[PDB]
């Protein structure tokens, strides 16, 4: 199967597969069962921000999710990415809905990756920034029900004409160019991702979440990965 590392913004507690009893943020290393989570006071209808950082010196992946004028949720996990991901990968955003729904709208997404090999300061870096998505976003790989164009935003999951979220929906958005996430001779390798979301739920009972993920270059949506699987894993082991 695919190899997946992701930071998930879980909105429905499926405490049957290890989920906490409330909306949380977690770090997933090749499994939907998070290695570590943290209560997240999700505010329906409000724009929020997610910051993800990681450097090869500390080998620690951390994420911060906040809402203007509110306390923020923070989660970290000491993990060495060299022994988990191939050196070339793709980065993206995945979201899903099932019995219950919510809108998984992305308003902006920026990413920056730095790699410094031991021929020093000789630095290779990739940086892209999206403040608005056009109907035909060629530098993006849309999968499932994911669409752009809806005037500026990126709708990861199905939303009706009138604007309401649909159930049982899965969508992803991967950046076209592959990314060099780590390299043996690297003195220092780091990357940071930022995106603003708007999870809206008419019936105050959202589900299932949005996630920032890293995977093998040819990863695609697994079958039946709607709902609780956030369109990243085939099962819940």
């Amino acid at each position: 199967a695919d190899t997946i590392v992701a930071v998930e913004l879980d909105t429905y507690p499926n405490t049957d597969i290890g989920d906490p009893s409330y909306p949380h943020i977690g770090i997933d290393i090749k499994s939907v069962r998070s290695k570590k989570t943290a209560k997240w006071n999700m505010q329906n209808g409000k724009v929020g921000t997610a910051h993800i950082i990681y450097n090869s010196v500390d080998k620690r992946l951390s994420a911060v999710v906040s809402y203007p004028n509110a306390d923020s949720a923070t989660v970290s996990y000491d993990v060495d990415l060299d022994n988990v991901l191939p050196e070339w990968v793709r980065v993206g955003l995945s979201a899903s809905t099932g019995l219950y729904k919510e809108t998984n709208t992305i308003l902006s997404w920026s990413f920056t990756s730095k790699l410094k090999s031991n021929s020093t300061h000789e630095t290779n870096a990739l940086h892209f920034m999206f403040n608005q998505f056009s109907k035909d976003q060629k530098d993006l790989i849309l999968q499932g029900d994911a669409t752009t164009g809806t005037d500026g935003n990126l709708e990861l999951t199905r939303v009706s004409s009138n604007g309401s979220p649909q159930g049982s929906s899965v969508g992803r958005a991967l950046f076209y160019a592959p990314v060099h996430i780590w390299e043996s001779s690297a003195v220092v390798a780091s990357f940071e991702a930022t995106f603003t979301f708007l999870i809206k739920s008419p019936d105050s009972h959202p589900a299932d979440g949005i996630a920032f993920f890293i995977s093998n270059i040819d990863s695609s949506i697994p079958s039946g990965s709607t709902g609780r699987l956030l369109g990243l894993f085939p099962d819940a082991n």
């Binding site: 909105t11 409330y22 909306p23 505010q43 329906n44 209808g45 409000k46 809206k200 105050s204």
Partner: peptide, 6 residues
């Protein structure tokens, strides 16, 4: 005022 599920 748009903010809460739980």
């Amino acid at each position: 005022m748009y903010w809460y599920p739980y």
